[PDB]
Design a protein around this nucleic acid. Structure first.
Lengths: 146, 49, 260, 188
RNA sequence: ACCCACUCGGCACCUUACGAGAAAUCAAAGUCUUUGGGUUCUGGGGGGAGUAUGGUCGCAAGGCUGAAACUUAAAGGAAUUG
RNA sequence: GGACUUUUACUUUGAAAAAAUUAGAGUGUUCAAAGCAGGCGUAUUGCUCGAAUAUAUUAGCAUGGAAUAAUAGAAUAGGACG
RNA sequence: UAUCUGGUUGAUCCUGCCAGUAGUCAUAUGCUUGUCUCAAAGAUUAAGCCAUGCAUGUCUAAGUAUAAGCAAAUACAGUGAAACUGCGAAUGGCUCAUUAAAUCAGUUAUCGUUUAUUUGAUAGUUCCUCUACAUGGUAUAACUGUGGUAAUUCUAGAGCUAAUACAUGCUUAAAAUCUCGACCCUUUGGAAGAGAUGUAUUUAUUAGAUAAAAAAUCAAUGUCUUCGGACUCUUUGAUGAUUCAUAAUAACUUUUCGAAUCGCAUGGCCUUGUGCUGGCGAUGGUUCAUUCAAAUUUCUGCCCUAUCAACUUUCGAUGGUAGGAUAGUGGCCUACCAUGGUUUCAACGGGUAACGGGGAAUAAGGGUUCGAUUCCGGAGAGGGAGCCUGAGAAACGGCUACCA
């Protein structure tokens, strides 16, 4: 969502099975593991030289992007590190040969590498159920009006 | 639904008591006697066999 | 339902078995084996409904428990053994050898082969990985695994195991031109050459195939079974060579036959 | 018994879900096993597929590993000193994953002289070239060498005691140890 | 101020049917069996009935919303004729 | 192999599309409802065709088109090209 | 495949509804009934109640034969009751009460998991720095005899005996590499001999590279040149993507597996010894893959109701961290911390004489109505709950408790 201090919880926040050696000292400071999500998705600059942990980010975290890739507009960001996406579409009633507008709310996960506000057409991808309702994860962010 | 489900139960349970109590005359161990008459129609016919 | 299913009601069978919809309410249901049950052909269906050797259920049992039907060089006794694609089953009593290959219509067709070519069998490699203790192994399209393959064999290629010891002989790669048998979908049973592989990231690669009569069609990659080079296959093709004549020109092909 | 199904929970719109089937078995949950300290008591639990899950009901002599030096020596356990999730697990000395405990340090101390030659807290000439080749690398972090003088180390269990029977782990070192000492002085 | 001519916007008036309607009549009730410019509301035979019941606003008088059971072959509207 | 690569709706073509049911091709079940059979021989150890095809308007995937209907961009240039 | 006609209607014209007419893979009932093919049938009301009988048991050459069973190899050898063992009983069949984003349909996912079985691969390392392996040990059933109960698929105590039961237990190559070191002879040092190194589990660490190319540095500094110091071909698989597959090191484990099983044949070798060696199978066994499945999961879609406008968080409601639990993800549960989540695009509540679907009737088109019912999926076995066995069951032709 925004920038906080790293170790604020009651447990140490670290990337698991990433071990920096306290004996040998290197100019490269902290062992930070990161990957690329594939599907032609570029790793954001903030994910590579960041300082957060976020075990559920598709980058620098332990999840995967496989399955459906969706698109919608952000309607709320009041949660902690997750947002709500409104998907708008038209439904075809066959009897009347006409359409009607509908909408559905998708709760997705947003990493602390994207700065996401309302507006914000966002591309998300299916991400291995992470809390009861949240099955997608924010991948790409495009602006609303600038 | 529960009032509907209970009422159908209450009317059937009253119905099934009505069938049993009307059939209380014929538990043929002590208090029953069904009266049966064999009436053959032909003189060449014995009710004994 | 609390555990695996054991029966199969007739009319829930695969349609390409051509089972009579009357005459009993149950279907063979092939047991577990080298092929998925919706793409296989049980030994009871092959020897009773297809070749008309047997006549009952207990009669085809007497065929098999006599140890007379050898599927892929090994003897079988289960009447519902899933004999599938490119199985090279043989009958030693009549000295006749079969290869279960699809017709152009899409159903399994009997195809008598010589004693030669009844000792080898093509198989599409489906996954290559490293096993325990560092050995690499490939797995083909009928559940078989072979250790120590040639290092140029990748996923979705063709290997040539013989029959008795695995031992992958020369293999066929995947590029433009290679002759392709189709093993699933609407174009089930057609034979042609690759012209274009449009890779899609996310799933379900599509392959463009042009046959010998310049009729292009598109299929998923899962249904693609490469069998050799342009005009030179590695097996004996079935009758009709996979051309898919249209419904009008099949009737005109019929009309040349009745009468004399 | 306990169920892990999501059909007994209210929906995302606040709706109440009405039951449609009884509890199944492929969704059961078992009662937690609070792994205490004392004599070794290990119980097997038959799981789906016929497998086994060794519930550690009372464990000691766990295997703790020195991360920087890359050794693992089987040591005793003195007790829990901090727990991030539940405070009451410290008060009853219940060993879980990611619980900060105190282990016996003498197997690690005994390993140091036989491998490096120096002595912390205070002939066979092939052994001194072993000591000289490994020399200029025996300098360790300042807090852990002070802990050897007390005879008692700090470590974190990285194993699941109630799911494998063993209580393994690793000893704290570096910035992670600096975080946990701050926790013991400001909250404990 | 009045007269003449034109124009824009009005309240209406008279004749007619290219059309429309069951007819009275209608420059809109026209451009609808050759049926689609946009869009809100309302109706679906008569009694029972604006009744019962619930909700709501009102100090009250009341208002707004508003059924069903049952029964019935009617209920109507336009113009002329003795 | 790297990237800039507006966002849609719409419509064509295609793939993956259970059988049964519906339409429909072939076939004298004695005709037919049906069924998927059967047909031809020197009927002396035989030969052989068939068991098609179509329909599914939503949702998802691929591709062709760029009219119609939306959407964004250079006005403090905080704009493009070397 | 496209026709209407009567009531109102008193003379006329229209709004209007009713009645008539026809179909029904739509139920009942009445009258009548010769022939052939074909065939639905206690769904609606009472998912109400059950007398009686049957519906799940099973043996090949290939697990155990001393039946005082039958019938014709001096350990047995043919057939074969009973019983132990293994497997099955979780399929089939029935019903539609529940159930309104639930089930279900089509389409995705498991880089988020379990899998008996079939199919294919897969085990020179076990005790050990002094020993049963031309083969370790017990219990028991069936049986013998003695009894109890009114009764049941009730069983007690006593004596026997087998395993593919249960409980233990060993052979097998050489090489290589690491720690520990008799050390000596004096060094730019190199050395006898001691241990360890399968698989499975658990933890920690390392490798798992690869956009094209030029020098000055020091440290670890090696083979060779010409000891100036020169310096090379250097091994790395797959995915769109991985902390993947796999490998290496340090250890851990009430130490998992690594054949004490069975059938059919008498082959070959000489050193001619009851020596050595060997064929064709059957059943087991660890891991991987495969198959039959299963559990969760993505997008979209469901009937009536505003006389239901706010709903969800007491008692998890939405999110975060950590743990526990599970086969596994996940508020699934727990501890703490946030205050969120849905809704006029109809949330939430209510009704359904609502299992969903493929499909059925009706035909000028679009539609209207129906779908308990021969196929697919879900659920239940009088109502709830709990659990054993097993790969699989919250099973009812299994058990336990409560209610009727």
């Amino acid at each position: 969502s925004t920038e906080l201090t790293v170790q604020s919880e009651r447990a140490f926040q670290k990337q698991p099975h990433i071990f920096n050696n306290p004996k040998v000292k290197t100019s490269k400071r902290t062992k930070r593991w990161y990957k690329n999500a594939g599907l032609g998705f570029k790793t954001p600059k903030t994910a590579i030289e960041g300082s957060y942990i976020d075990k559920k980010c598709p980058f620098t975290g332990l999840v995967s992007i496989r399955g459906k890739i969706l698109t919608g507009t952000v309607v709320s960001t009041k949660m902690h590190r997750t947002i709500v996406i409104r998907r708008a579409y038209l439904h075809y009633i066959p009897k009347y040969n006409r359409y009607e507008k509908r909408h559905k709310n998708v709760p997705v996960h947003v990493s602390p590498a994207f700065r996401v506000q309302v507006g914000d057409i966002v591309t998300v991808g299916q991400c291995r159920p992470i809390s009861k309702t949240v099955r997608f994860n924010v991948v790409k962010v495009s602006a609303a009006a600038g | 639904k529960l009032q509907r489900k209970n009422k159908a139960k209450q009317l059937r349970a009253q119905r099934i008591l009505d069938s049993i109590e009307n059939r209380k005359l014929f538990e043929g161990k002590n208090g029953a006697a069904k009266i049966i008459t064999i009436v053959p129609l032909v003189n060449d016919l014995d009710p004994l066999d | 339902a609390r555990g695996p299913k054991k029966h199969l009601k007739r009319l829930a069978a695969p349609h390409h078995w051509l089972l009579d919809k009357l005459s009993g309410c149950y279907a063979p249901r092939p047991s577990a084996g080298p092929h998925k049950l919706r793409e296989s052909l049980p030994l009871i269906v092959f020897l009773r409904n297809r070749l008309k050797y047997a006549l009952n259920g207990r009669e085809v049992k007497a065929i098999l428990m006599q140890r007379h039907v050898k599927v892929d060089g090994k003897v079988r006794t289960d009447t519902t053994y899933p004999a599938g694609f490119m199985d090279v089953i043989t009958l030693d009593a009549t000295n006749e050898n079969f290869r279960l290959v699809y017709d152009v219509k899409g159903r399994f067709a009997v195809h008598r082969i010589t004693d030669e070519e009844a000792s080898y069998k093509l198989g599409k490699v489906k996954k290559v990985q490293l096993g325990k203790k560092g050995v690499p192994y490939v797995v083909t399209h009928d559940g078989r695994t072979i250790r120590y393959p040639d290092p140029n064999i990748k996923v979705n290629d063709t290997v040539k195991i013989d029959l008795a010891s695995g031992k992958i002989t020369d293999f066929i790669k995947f590029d433009a031109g290679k002759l392709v048998y189709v093993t699933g979908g609407r174009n089930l049973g057609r034979i042609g050459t690759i012209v274009h592989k449009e890779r899609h990231d996310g799933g379900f690669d599509l392959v463009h195939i042009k046959d010998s009569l310049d009729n292009t069609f598109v299929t998923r990659l899962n249904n693609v079974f490469v069998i050799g080079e342009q005009g030179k296959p590695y097996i004996s093709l079935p009758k009709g060579k996979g051309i898919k004549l249209s419904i009008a020109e099949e009737r005109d092909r019929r009309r040349a036959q009745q009468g004399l | 018994g306990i169920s892990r199904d999501s059909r007994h929970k209210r929906s995302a719109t606040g709706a109440k879900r009405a039951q449609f089937r009884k509890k199944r078995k492929f969704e059961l949950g078992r009662q937690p096993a609070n792994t205490k300290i004392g004599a070794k008591r290990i119980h097997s639990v038959r799981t789906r597929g016929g497998n086994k899950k060794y519930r550690a009901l009372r464990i000691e002599t766990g295997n703790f590993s020195w991360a920087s030096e890359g050794i693992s020596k089987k040591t005793r356990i003195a007790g829990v000193v901090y727990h991030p999730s539940n405070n009451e697990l410290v008060r009853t000395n219940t060993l879980t994953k990611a619980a900060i405990v105190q282990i016996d340090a003498t197997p690690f101390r005994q390993w140091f002289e036989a491998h490096y030659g120096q002595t912390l807290g205070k002939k066979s000439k092939n052994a001194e070239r072993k000591w000289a080749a490994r020399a200029a690398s025996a300098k360790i972090e300042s807090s852990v060498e002070s802990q050897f003088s007390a005879g008692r180390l700090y470590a974190c269990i990285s194993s699941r005691p109630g799911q494998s029977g063993r209580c393994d782990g690793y000893i704290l070192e570096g910035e992670e140890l600096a975080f946990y000492l701050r926790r013991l002085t400001a909250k404990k």
